[PDB]
Scaffold this motif. Structure first.
Motif, short mmCIF file in Angstrom:
data_model
loop_
_atom_site.label_atom_id
_atom_site.label_comp_id
_atom_site.label_asym_id
_atom_site.label_seq_id
_atom_site.Cartn_x
_atom_site.Cartn_y
_atom_site.Cartn_z
N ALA A 26 -17.00 51.35 7.53
CA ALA A 26 -17.88 52.50 7.35
C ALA A 26 -19.10 52.40 8.25
O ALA A 26 -19.50 53.39 8.88
CB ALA A 26 -18.29 52.61 5.88
N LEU A 27 -19.71 51.21 8.33
CA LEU A 27 -20.84 51.02 9.24
C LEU A 27 -20.45 51.32 10.68
O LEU A 27 -21.16 52.04 11.40
CB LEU A 27 -21.38 49.60 9.12
CG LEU A 27 -22.22 49.28 7.88
CD1 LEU A 27 -22.46 47.78 7.81
CD2 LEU A 27 -23.53 50.03 7.90
N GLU A 28 -19.31 50.79 11.12
CA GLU A 28 -18.84 51.07 12.48
C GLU A 28 -18.65 52.57 12.68
O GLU A 28 -19.02 53.12 13.72
CB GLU A 28 -17.54 50.33 12.75
CG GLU A 28 -17.22 50.17 14.23
CD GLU A 28 -15.85 49.54 14.47
OE1 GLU A 28 -15.63 49.01 15.58
OE2 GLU A 28 -15.01 49.56 13.54
N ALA B 19 -29.16 47.86 14.74
CA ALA B 19 -29.21 47.44 13.35
C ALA B 19 -27.82 47.46 12.73
O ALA B 19 -27.45 46.51 12.03
CB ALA B 19 -30.16 48.34 12.57
N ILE B 20 -27.04 48.51 12.98
CA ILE B 20 -25.74 48.64 12.34
C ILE B 20 -24.83 47.48 12.71
O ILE B 20 -24.23 46.84 11.84
CB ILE B 20 -25.09 50.00 12.68
CG1 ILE B 20 -25.83 51.13 11.97
CG2 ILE B 20 -23.61 50.00 12.30
CD1 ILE B 20 -25.41 52.53 12.39
N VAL B 21 -24.71 47.18 14.01
CA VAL B 21 -23.84 46.09 14.42
C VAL B 21 -24.39 44.74 13.99
O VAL B 21 -23.64 43.76 13.93
CB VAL B 21 -23.59 46.11 15.95
CG1 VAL B 21 -23.04 47.46 16.38
CG2 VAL B 21 -24.85 45.77 16.72
N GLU B 65 -32.49 47.21 4.99
CA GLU B 65 -33.75 47.84 4.60
C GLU B 65 -34.37 48.58 5.77
O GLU B 65 -34.93 49.67 5.60
CB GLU B 65 -34.72 46.79 4.04
CG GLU B 65 -36.16 47.28 3.86
CD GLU B 65 -36.29 48.45 2.89
OE1 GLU B 65 -35.28 48.88 2.30
OE2 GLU B 65 -37.43 48.96 2.74
N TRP B 66 -34.29 48.01 6.97
CA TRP B 66 -34.79 48.71 8.15
C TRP B 66 -34.07 50.04 8.33
O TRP B 66 -34.70 51.07 8.61
CB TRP B 66 -34.63 47.84 9.39
CG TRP B 66 -35.20 48.48 10.62
CD1 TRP B 66 -36.44 48.29 11.14
CD2 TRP B 66 -34.54 49.42 11.48
NE1 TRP B 66 -36.60 49.05 12.28
CE2 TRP B 66 -35.45 49.76 12.50
CE3 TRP B 66 -33.27 50.01 11.48
CZ2 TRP B 66 -35.13 50.65 13.52
CZ3 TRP B 66 -32.96 50.90 12.49
CH2 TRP B 66 -33.88 51.21 13.50
N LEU B 67 -32.74 50.04 8.18
CA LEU B 67 -31.99 51.29 8.26
C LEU B 67 -32.46 52.28 7.20
O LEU B 67 -32.56 53.48 7.46
CB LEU B 67 -30.50 51.03 8.11
CG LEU B 67 -29.76 50.58 9.37
CD1 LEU B 67 -28.35 50.16 8.98
CD2 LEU B 67 -29.73 51.68 10.42
#
Ligand SMILES: [Ca+2]
Ligand SMILES: [Ca+2]
Lengths: 90, 89, 91, 90, 91, 90, 91, 90, 91, 90
Positions: A26-28, B19-21, B65-67
């Motif tokens: 989901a993040l990807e 941030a996501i990766v 938390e940053w996201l």
């Protein structure tokens, strides 16, 4: 899909494995959808991509709440940092 | 490492990408470390693997938390489900 | 993510590329979620995975309709085969 | 398959075979389409365009099978396919 | 998509690149489609997979004929070995 | 190397799998060798790469002839298109 | 295909790169072909796979001789160990 | 690591596999080390990378000699081309 | 996962495998985090990524110490080169 | 080979990148060599594989010392944990 044989993994470890990879996927998806929204040159498509992006965030949050409820250190570390004020580090 | 040319991506979109990766890699690390804790047959190693696992969870929470603070939809959906008691669906 | 230089690709080709991979992404999620639903031993998690699974099907259907509206042959072949009866080959 | 076949239902494994086939045809459509734009040989371009459109046909065939063997595929495809107006409002 | 910069590659080389990977991908589909035909337990799906499988062979054959017409060594070697009798390694 | 369990694949299917991937690997080698021939700035190396390139074509043709002899629709489709004149889309 | 940007790589280094990966690909082909020779249950194919396998060894040797001629340390180490008798670790 | 089940592969085929992939790894390391030597802007690191690079060449040669001693065609083809003079297409 | 079947591996070899890949992954994170520290245009994120980067070094150092205690040649070579004055290519 | 464009990365960061990947690949070789040493059924090959394995350990240690000398936190954390006794957790 697991890196050690199922025979040596507890049940609870494989269930957390299924949730973690689901959050990862989901993040990807959120990341790729976000990039296509910026790059897309068709507004109809952009609206679809933006809608799907935000539902992927929902899926990740749902599965992450499950992890919080089924892992003592997920609950500890999430409660520490989420919905906090000031520097995220300290 | 991005799927679109940087020249067409907003600056804020690329920072959220970082941030996501970062959360993804921590999640991947938690999962693999957790499996090695179960499969390990050396107690010393198991202690290291379990300790590092728990700090990877910390890394994910910090970056997540940053996201939450830099994306309204992340903030909305995280606020709905996190720290809830009751059926998630 | 494109296999040819963007300088030589029509915009509509790149936009369809974005749509097609989106369908692929979602189809992959549908399949994996479904396997985890069968294999999961926690009903709570299974409820989440089954819910997410079915929304990925929605994402694919949405994006595929866009392809139908922006590609003459997607529309032809989808019209031919979808919502029909009898053998799928030759229909 | 990402789970052992011992725990997967036969219907789940058959849908896996169909879903993967649609994915691979979709991927072929995309790559063929890009090569059609980039090709500098008239006879090659004609072949790639011919194959591209048949890959769409393969995907449509296998996608109909999913529609007939999965209720939610039938529901969501019925909602959005062959419609007019905003796709995100349906 | 290529190993060397497009600046240094001759035009015909990049066109043959497009044809070869097309043959590769079609061959890959034939193999995977063929394995799913053996493993499928649904006769309607098995019919679809077998139909698509044989059309992938046609795609491979078409693009391979293009290669024969645009590469002197493909034409030579395909002339030596295809549509022959007796031990293949012999010829 | 196979996608489905050998328990369920016919013997003949696995032998064609061995031939198909052999043709794939040779074709990939032809493509990469050819690009290195174009890019190489050492003539001695270019002569080796070009020599190897053309023998990979021979390997592919050999293995493809075997497939033609052990698969009816390989034989049918190859007969239709190979060594022909005029548009290939025919 | 290069780990570092071409702009900083000397042309000799990129040429040795082209040879090294050519040898790598041939070594990989030898290994796979050899495994398929053992597992194949059709003699005609086994003869083809065995023939192709041995020509892949030739390609590796040819490109490796080029490396020996264009890299002093390849020449030194290949001279120490190839065509020797007794323990390899002690030559 | 093998593309066929170990049950159908001869003992000696699997040993040559272990030797071959070892040479492949060494070759890959030689190539990457050399590229980092060219791009590096730190003399201390470059000295390490060059030293390690040349030992990877030694590893490849050692394992390659083993292949020569345990495979007749390796011995034939290496004898034909190595330590020669004149065009390598001979 | 391992390359050889777990039935031919000693229990210690697999434990060292679990340690080595942990170091590799930790090393990879240090490298990626550090690159994101340089490129980030948000100071908050930069502080998080830099913090995580340095904790990954601890993970690598911890797991590497375990290897030193469980492999004779790790102890030898780490003893020779780490914490030393002078050129690294001569110690 | 970097994940961010080399234009935004400091020079020293790219040099540490070159060292880190070198350590990673050396560790990867140690692991694979070690597994082949256990599984090999030819003594002469095992002797080669074991010899190369231990030289890969040397390469990693060399490159790791450079990292210690060019990164303050590597030096801190390696000092804390290497050549110690008692539980590594504390
Ligand atoms: Ca995905
Ligand atoms: Ca330089």
């Amino acid at each position: 899909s697991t890196h050690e044989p199922l025979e040596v993994l507890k049940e609870e470890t494989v269930n957390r494995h299924r949730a973690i990879v689901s959050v990862m996927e989901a993040l990807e998806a959120v990341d790729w959808y976000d990039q296509r929204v910026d790059a897309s040159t068709d507004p109809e498509l952009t609206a679809i991509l933006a809608h799907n992006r935000d539902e992927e965030k929902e899926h990740a949050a749902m599965t992450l709440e499950w992890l919080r409820r089924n892992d003592a250190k997920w609950a500890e570390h999430l409660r520490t940092y989420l919905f906090t004020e000031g520097p995220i580090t300290a």
